[PDB]
Design a protein around this nucleic acid. Structure first.
Ligand SMILES: [Cl-]
Ligand SMILES: [Cl-]
Ligand SMILES: [Mg+2]
Ligand SMILES: [Mg+2]
Ligand SMILES: [Mg+2]
Ligand SMILES: [Mg+2]
Ligand SMILES: [Mg+2]
Ligand SMILES: [Mg+2]
Ligand SMILES: [Mg+2]
Ligand SMILES: [Mg+2]
Ligand SMILES: [Mg+2]
Ligand SMILES: [Mg+2]
Ligand SMILES: [Mg+2]
Ligand SMILES: [Mg+2]
Ligand SMILES: [Mg+2]
Ligand code: NA
Ligand code: NA
Ligand code: NA
Ligand code: NA
Ligand code: NA
Ligand code: NA
Ligand code: NA
Ligand code: NA
Ligand code: NA
Ligand code: NA
Ligand code: NA
Ligand SMILES: [Sr+2]
Ligand SMILES: [Sr+2]
Ligand SMILES: [Sr+2]
Ligand SMILES: [Sr+2]
Ligand SMILES: [Sr+2]
Ligand SMILES: [Sr+2]
Ligand SMILES: [Sr+2]
Ligand SMILES: [Sr+2]
Ligand SMILES: [Sr+2]
Ligand SMILES: [Sr+2]
Ligand SMILES: [Sr+2]
Ligand SMILES: [Sr+2]
Ligand SMILES: [Sr+2]
Ligand SMILES: [Sr+2]
Ligand SMILES: [Sr+2]
Ligand SMILES: [Sr+2]
Ligand SMILES: [Sr+2]
Ligand SMILES: [Sr+2]
Ligand SMILES: [Sr+2]
Ligand SMILES: [Sr+2]
Ligand SMILES: [Sr+2]
Ligand SMILES: [Sr+2]
Ligand SMILES: [Sr+2]
Ligand SMILES: [Sr+2]
Ligand SMILES: [Sr+2]
Ligand SMILES: [Sr+2]
Ligand SMILES: [Sr+2]
Ligand SMILES: [Sr+2]
Ligand SMILES: [Sr+2]
Lengths: 143, 82, 46, 56, 81
RNA sequence: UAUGCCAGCUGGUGGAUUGCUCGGCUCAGGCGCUGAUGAAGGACGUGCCAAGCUGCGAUAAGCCAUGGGGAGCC
RNA sequence: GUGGAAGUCUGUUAGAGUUGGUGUCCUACAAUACCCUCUCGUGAUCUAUGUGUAGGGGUGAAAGGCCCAUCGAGUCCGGCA
RNA sequence: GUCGGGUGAGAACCCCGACGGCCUAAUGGAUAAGGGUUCCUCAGCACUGCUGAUCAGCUGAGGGUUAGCCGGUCCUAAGUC
RNA sequence: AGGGAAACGUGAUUCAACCUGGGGCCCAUGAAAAGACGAGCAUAGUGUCCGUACCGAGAACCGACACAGGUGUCCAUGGCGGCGAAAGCCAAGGCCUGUCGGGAGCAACCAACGUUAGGGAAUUCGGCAAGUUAGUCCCGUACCUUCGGAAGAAGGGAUGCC
RNA sequence: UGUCCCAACGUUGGGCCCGGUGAACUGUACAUUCCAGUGCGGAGUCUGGAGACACCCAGGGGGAAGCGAAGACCCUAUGGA
């Protein structure tokens, strides 16, 4: 008996890769008589032909690592492979910081805390990279 | 029918990436001899196959306990794990 | 490639010629297609 | 890269094809001229006395 | 003068088209258009042709798949030849 | 007496030799233009079964007339 | 600090190439191949297809290099015995 | 690769299952050129296949490519006639 | 509608495709034409002709071959990893045809490779071959210089896990 | 730092034996040779001695001025480019 053709039809009718279709060893004769796709669907229902399950990689070990690293662990010098600028894009970081400092200054202004002129002076200084962070900016504003 | 312990140390004579194969051969030869039957008449149950290939093709267990029965008109043996 | 209708007609003919000399011709002439071609071993024209 | 075998693998261009006028696979589909019968080049049929021995 | 219809194309696939889709298949002159195939057929077996699909075959001939109207029954038309 | 040398016998292999000739080669005489009224050439078709050759052209190994011929033919 | 230039650097990214082994092969897997090492990799870059230039003529960042395994003058047939 | 089994006159290499492996810009998917039926089915093993063969891109016989809206077809590019 | 044995979700982050802007460069300036828009709606009819299989490669192409060569495009966002389209391992998918097998602790010899005490280039034309170093962070860095560079100079320290 | 002193042990594929498949190079003849001599002065084959029972397996290549290519070097030709 040669069932490679039936294997091809079964993969199509079961909508799976040929390598995953299973043919019951005790029914080679019946499967061998299967000519049409209808013949294959029939044997599928009988359970003579089935589709093996596909694998999915476990992410459990990854998840634990993700947690440790999110908590700031497992990132010591001995675990870094890329250059510092590769681990954190500097221009990107500046965009993060400067936007946070401007949003900050914009809120203080509409809030009345700063006069357009005080705002301007702080805004221009931020753009000149005078403040390391939002807090650094606040500390400054507090004279 | 009886339980026998097959030593597979002689598989070490074959290249290491193919030890499993040689093991399966030693097993057949051991039974054929000890049960006084032709190697052609020795049937190895898949259980034995899986035992020898457990760690892949390059790692065989040093020995293996196998349960074999001898019978029929032409004289043959059937073997399996234990 | 892309075959035109004419190319196709020519390929079709070549396919037809590529057949066995009928058995009855064997008997009638009391005893070979010298133009037998293989798609791989040979090369057609055009 | 050698001019031999390695350079033969790049040959997948179609040039000479079956000619409408004479039937020979000599119609250069890029020049639109038959190298065998002259179709596309001359109304007269391509011919030369050197295609045979001089006294024949 | 060449005729349009050459002969009925009879094969397993042709029969299925005839039993399940009221379609008839013909080997026809490769110079014939879908329309010319439609007319010729209606005039040879007196039926109403609804659609015609064509294919230039690797046998050097043209094959036509002619679907008849629900008014006609392919199985019966083909059965009289 | 192994491996083996030389000669022959029986049987192979091989296709020489002899015989045979539907093919060539050369000479002699005769004859001699074809095509837009689409030639020559080619392509693709065409048979009950049909691949090749030959013939033929959708009227497709053929259709018609006259004379010849003759009980066979495809 | 920002910015992000460059015939700019690293890079078996794709892709291109080939310093050494004078390794393997050398009736080959191959009439120019295999492996490791090595070089280039935003530009005078690499690459597909189309197209043009023809033989004492092309094409050549020039080696007499290349113009279908052949070029200090291609190939084919003819001159030709 | 191995153990069982299937088919067969015949099975290391044709098929089923299990176990064991290989490939991740590819050894996976879709395609251009080019090839031209190599595609599918049945029946086969003299030929072809780095051994064998019940297999096959092999041999015999049949079958298969369906479009207003996917290409062509239309436009013009270097350029050609 | 369809599809699924079933459930037949909801929010979020990072965001290829695709959309839309801002900046910079040129002794370099990055096609053309057909067509479309501009220019409504109903209903009906017509929409012919050619291609369409398959391979697309360690056996369907070229290389005399079922040749380890050569041969364009797109899949560039599958998981862990890490800077990564890197390595290594693993899915989806494919394969056991980079197609002869059986046997000998399986000798000499050869290919490719692992490990070698002490000495450490004595070897050799020549460190050829092999090896040494190595990723990332911190400290630190000479001569010279066209002030750009030299420079990762050199040298020193650190590196896991919880 | 096995490049070396100075080599050793191990790994994988071959090698060896068995089944199947199955070429090519080369071949005036003879041929078991060795030491001297002789010879166109570089002999398995001539001369004189010596040695030599036949056949087979594996081996590394001393000889056959080994095989492969009508020497590329040099000269000659009332040769070529
Ligand atoms: Cl298309
Ligand atoms: Cl902007
Ligand atoms: Mg079959
Ligand atoms: Mg910056
Ligand atoms: Mg292995
Ligand atoms: Mg056929
Ligand atoms: Mg169509
Ligand atoms: Mg080009
Ligand atoms: Mg192969
Ligand atoms: Mg040492
Ligand atoms: Mg010395
Ligand atoms: Mg070195
Ligand atoms: Mg000479
Ligand atoms: Mg000279
Ligand atoms: Mg001269
Ligand atoms: Na071909
Ligand atoms: Na027909
Ligand atoms: Na005449
Ligand atoms: Na015929
Ligand atoms: Na600056
Ligand atoms: Na090199
Ligand atoms: Na010339
Ligand atoms: Na990733
Ligand atoms: Na095989
Ligand atoms: Na060593
Ligand atoms: Na020797
Ligand atoms: Sr070929
Ligand atoms: Sr080059
Ligand atoms: Sr190459
Ligand atoms: Sr090409
Ligand atoms: Sr012309
Ligand atoms: Sr002439
Ligand atoms: Sr056909
Ligand atoms: Sr660069
Ligand atoms: Sr680089
Ligand atoms: Sr060299
Ligand atoms: Sr090396
Ligand atoms: Sr070589
Ligand atoms: Sr870049
Ligand atoms: Sr050349
Ligand atoms: Sr001549
Ligand atoms: Sr047989
Ligand atoms: Sr097939
Ligand atoms: Sr965004
Ligand atoms: Sr398709
Ligand atoms: Sr592919
Ligand atoms: Sr390839
Ligand atoms: Sr898989
Ligand atoms: Sr095989
Ligand atoms: Sr050790
Ligand atoms: Sr030295
Ligand atoms: Sr020295
Ligand atoms: Sr350091
Ligand atoms: Sr003597
Ligand atoms: Sr030897």
């Amino acid at each position: 008996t040669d069932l490679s053709a039936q294997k091809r039809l079964a993969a199509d009718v079961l909508d799976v890769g040929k390598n995953r279709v299973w043919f019951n060893p005790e029914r080679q004769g019946d499967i061998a008589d299967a000519i049409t796709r209808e013949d294959v669907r029939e044997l599928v229902d009988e359970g003579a032909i089935q589709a093996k399950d596909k694998k999915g990689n476990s992410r459990g070990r990854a998840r634990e690592r993700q947690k440790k690293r999110a908590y700031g662990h497992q990132k010591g010098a001995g675990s870094r492979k890329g250059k510092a600028g590769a681990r954190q894009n500097s221009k990107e970081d500046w965009e993060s910081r400067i936007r946070a400092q401007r949003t900050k200054l914009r809120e203080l202004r509409d809030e009345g805390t700063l006069s357009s002129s005080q705002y301007r002076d702080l805004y221009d200084k931020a753009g000149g990279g005078e403040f390391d962070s939002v807090a650094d900016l606040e500390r400054y504003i507090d004279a | 029918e009886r339980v026998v312990t097959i030593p597979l140390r002689d598989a070490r004579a074959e290249p290491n990436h193919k030890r499993a194969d040689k093991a399966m051969i030693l097993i057949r030869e051991h039974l054929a001899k000890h049960f006084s039957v032709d190697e052609d008449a020795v049937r190895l149950d898949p259980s034995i196959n899986e035992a020898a290939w457990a760690r892949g093709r390059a790692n065989t267990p040093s020995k293996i306990r196998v349960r074999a029965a001898r019978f029929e008109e032409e004289g043959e043996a059937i073997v399996e794990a234990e | 490639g892309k075959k035109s209708k004419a190319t196709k007609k020519r390929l079709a003919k070549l396919d037809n010629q590529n057949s066995r000399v009928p058995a009855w011709v064997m008997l009638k002439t009391d005893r070979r297609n010298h133009k037998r071609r293989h798609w791989r071993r040979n090369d057609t024209d055009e | 890269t050698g001019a031999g075998t390695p350079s033969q693998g790049k040959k997948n261009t179609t040039t000479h094809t079956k000619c409408r006028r004479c039937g020979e696979k000599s119609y250069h589909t890029k020049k639109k001229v038959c190298s065998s019968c002259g179709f596309g080049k001359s109304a007269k049929r391509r011919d030369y006395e050197w295609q045979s021995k001089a006294g024949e | 003068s060449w005729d349009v219809i050459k002969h009925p194309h009879v094969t397993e696939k042709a029969m299925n088209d005839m039993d399940f889709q009221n379609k008839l298949q013909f080997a026809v002159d490769d110079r014939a258009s879908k329309g010319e195939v439609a007319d010729a057929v209606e005039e040879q077996y007196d039926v109403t042709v609804e659609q015609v699909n064509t294919q230039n075959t690797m046998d050097g001939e043209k094959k036509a798949v002619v679907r008849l109207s629900e008014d006609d029954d392919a199985q019966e038309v083909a059965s009289r030849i």
